[PDB]
Amino acid sequence: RLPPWLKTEIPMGKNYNKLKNTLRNLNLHTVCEEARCPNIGECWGGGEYATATATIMLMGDTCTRGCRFCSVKTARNPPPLDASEPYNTAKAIAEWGLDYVVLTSVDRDDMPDGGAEHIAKTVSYLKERNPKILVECLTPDFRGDLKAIEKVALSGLDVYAHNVETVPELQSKVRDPRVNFDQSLRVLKHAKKVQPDVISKTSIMLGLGENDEQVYATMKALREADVDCLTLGQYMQPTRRHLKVEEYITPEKFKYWEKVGNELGFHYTASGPLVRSSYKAGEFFLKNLVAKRK
Ligand SMILES: OC[C@H]1O[C@H](O[C@H]2O[C@H](CO)[C@@H](O)[C@H](O)[C@H]2O)[C@H](O)[C@@H](O)[C@@H]1O
Ligand code: SF4
Ligand code: SF4
Secondary structure, three states: OOOHHHOOOOOOOHHHHHHHHHHHOOOOOOHHHHOOOOOHHHHEOOOOOOOEEEEEEOOOOEEOOOOOOOOOEEOOOOOOOOOOHHHHHHHHHHHHOOOEEEEEOOOOOOOOOOOHHHHHHHHHHHHHHOOOOEEEEEOOOHHHOHHHHHHHHOOOOOEEEOOOEOOHHHHHHHOOOOOOHHHHHHHHHHHHHHOOOOEEEEEEEEOOOOOHHHHHHHHHHHHHOOOOEEEEEEOOOOOOOOOOOOOOOOHHHHHHHHHHHHHHOOOEEEEOOOOOOOOOHHHHHHHHOOOOOO
């Protein structure tokens, strides 16, 4: 029986309903719906600024790697690249009227640049169509290919996100051995080197056995790498094959880590059991970076 802080009420807001109705006549899938995310009523217009945030996966909604913690659907092979997806997806997002979109993609080992040009093309169409829409790219590490990272970071996005997922001592238990903490930090550093204007962001999951000393040291290492924004949320086991949850971190302990993030100087620290990288991302951006007056 899950603790009650991992549950939400059914989404019922006026803004949620309007976004939901409009989406149904568009040709566009969201992670929000596909993953049955409990946060949809809050992200789709439910917050203080009434912003609409959603997450859209580019280059297919499955991954072949089968990582031990990951909730993305597994498939034995990658799907084909749709050359019309950058144009069509940018068009649909702009018509839908999101305020903040997280464009995300899985590890595409089949492509030399990991999909970086395809991602950058999508950002470029979207920013040409509606420069008011904020754009975050949440990407894999591109095997540390600095040119692929540069392609995404120069694309015109607002936020470059790349997740470290756990503390260094748990990387081999949790993440695939093709990735690691140092390489992920080098991604974030390189994005800021080539585009110093971009906001850098990472996310970590708690509940995988990390201790407080390890979490704090990780947060300090991220500040040293000039990471602007951080999210911390609960690891939820997708199926019985995936890693067991070591513990459900309490609501107040997540609030402690928010305080720690504030003190270490992150521009925002989104922290809570249901947090993930995209959770209310447009609201965190407007409140904490833009400082928008209501
Ligand atoms: O806000 C002033 C400008 O800051 C940036 O431009 C400076 O920093 C760039 C590297 O990030 C340099 O290439 C540039 O020559 C500097 O002027 C920003 O990119 C500009 O858009 C701003 O106008
Ligand atoms: S963490 Fe990334 S590489 Fe691993 S299964 Fe998930 S999407 Fe694929
Ligand atoms: S947390 Fe992310 S995936 Fe979930 S509803 Fe919000 S934007 Fe969508």
